[model samples]
Target: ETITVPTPIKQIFSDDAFAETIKDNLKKKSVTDAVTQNELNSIDQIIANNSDIKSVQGIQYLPNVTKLFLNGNKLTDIKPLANLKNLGWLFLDENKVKDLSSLKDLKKLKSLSLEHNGISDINGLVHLPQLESLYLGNNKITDITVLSRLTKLDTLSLEDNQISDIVPLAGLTKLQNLYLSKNHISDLRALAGLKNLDVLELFSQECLNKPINHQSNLVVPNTVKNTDGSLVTPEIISDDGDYEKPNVKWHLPEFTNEVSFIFYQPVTIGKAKARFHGRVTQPLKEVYTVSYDVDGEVIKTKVEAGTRITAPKPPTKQGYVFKGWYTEKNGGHEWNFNTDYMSGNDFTLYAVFKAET
Candidate 1:
């Protein structure tokens, strides 16, 4: 029926395709009757995504619409969908929807996907008590304190935002899948409560305030689905490869008397000044060939041939066997001298393996 579509109430007529859909709905009434409100209620779902039709302006008429797919459209204001109380699932992703305040009163809304939008202020989301899965990724969302109230949320995608603290998420024990990929979240102790988590994708670990030292005692999760490839974690590999710190990692521990762990011991920041053999010698006295177990590896520092007030040797720490001194640290080019420094500023000579069996 060609009902009188008011110009101001031109909710349907504003968008030609919208009226077209309504016309199809009107066809259920013999295609010539004035479309009744009851008939409009019969139309319970709208599939208008990527349809190039903006203005879900006519959405208010369809009060019974349980699911609305209006993603990839050129819509801005969504105040029209406010009264559609029956909306169970709404996908408005990849749109220009700004007035997120229109999201209130949707008490029946279960799943809402608004990914790839510029939504920040989502105070209206607190009103949706039944929301199960909410995908609001790739936005400028900062404060997620409002999310604490969404206790019913099982899957929430807050990917690529500016959030740092997630203390609010601790209470959400129902969260099974959480995507916090490119945010600034360092402290994850809050998520320790979410035992149901399966799909975890937080790539960078250097952002962790805790050092990767196993002494810091961070638990290794079941899996980390990093974009690079999920084996261990981070651009922050070991001290050797760590140019930037994204997240901290944990490793196995060794205990002799007490437990000890390894983070990244050998850093090449400065293979700094070890192999100083004839490189720097006292003119008069001979500085002994101090082969130090620098950190874990060894380098040689030599003295002149004339001088010989030999620096006494240090008793090697337990686990350190002093391998005799050499011309080359890599291979014992030839065990030329077998001396060590005792009490000292740094007895970790260029290299050392305790001269024992």
Candidate 2:
């Protein structure tokens, strides 16, 4: 009666025979070895996820594996997992991994899912530093500035990438589940300061014209979890109706039959900087009063209609070689400071001297 089998599981079942071939591939995927002792000396954990596994090279000899479920595998070389290093949790999602610099020495990784891999440079996750949770979604990462040195990341998905500058995620702030949906983010004011975001996933409508109400309370939950787990609510409307209520704070209706409501209150950062005190109102333009007769010395300007007016450097007439600038003096068209645009009502421009024949 002798029972004692842990010497790194008898040296991975006699120097890598791999415990009766991973318990006969987990009993042909029926998976049952609930451990009645010596079931390959109680192998740590290896589900072999989808199991179509295209070579994990005998899982780098198991070395007391922590958790390694090679997801939907067709793994394109994981460099034999850079010697496992007692892997924390590693699920090479839908694998075909395109060089991860052999996972930068894995430093006790804490959860890494190389989603839909064909990874476009991640600088091999800067030596992992005990990563928290990282799933490089879809994949083709557009410079995340090396994820601002990881800072013990919380959970980052980077869904469908081509990520347009996130200002390096504003220093992660110990991020809390951020899955930047369908990339190309249109300036989110650099996500304010992440303030420990609970679950921010800019589901992309170009991030709905950016006024996320300064993210104070961080409410973007109108149902959104689809990476395939369904539950969607993304159509922040804007054909001409303009409606994007994430952390709602509407204002831009002086008198267009004002009627706006999509409320949720609790804003104070000195009242959101005194209600956006730095200001950026824009949406009320029809101011035109530009007059410039030059030789008559009448330079008045105040354009806005379609805006673009810079024709004011022509009147000298000492020799009359000035030749150019006239909206009408019987010529009716030639005020071009490299193409003009202010479109009617309140207009005047004259000075076309041409005597240097």
User: What TM-score does structure 1 among the candidates reach?
Assistant: 0.55
Q: How far is candidate 2 from the true structure (C-alpha RMSD, Å)?
A: 17.2
Name the best candidate (by TM-score): 1
| lDDT tens digits by residue: candidate 2, 238-295 | 1133334333233333323222222111112111211110111112245557787756
Q: Give the candidate number with the greatest lDDT.
A: 2
Report the C-alpha lDDT of model 1 over 109-137, residue by residue, as the tens digit.
99999888898887778888678999988
In angstroms, how far off is 242's CA in candidate 2?
Answer: 22
- Candidate 2 accuracy as TM-score: 0.27
lDDT of 1: 0.58
Q: Candidate 2, which segments miss by more than 4 Å at Cα?
A: 1-21, 25-36, 42-49, 52-64, 73-87, 92-109, 114-133, 139-150, 154-157, 161-168, 173-184, 188-357
Candidate 2: residue pairs that collide: none
lDDT of 1 at 51: 72
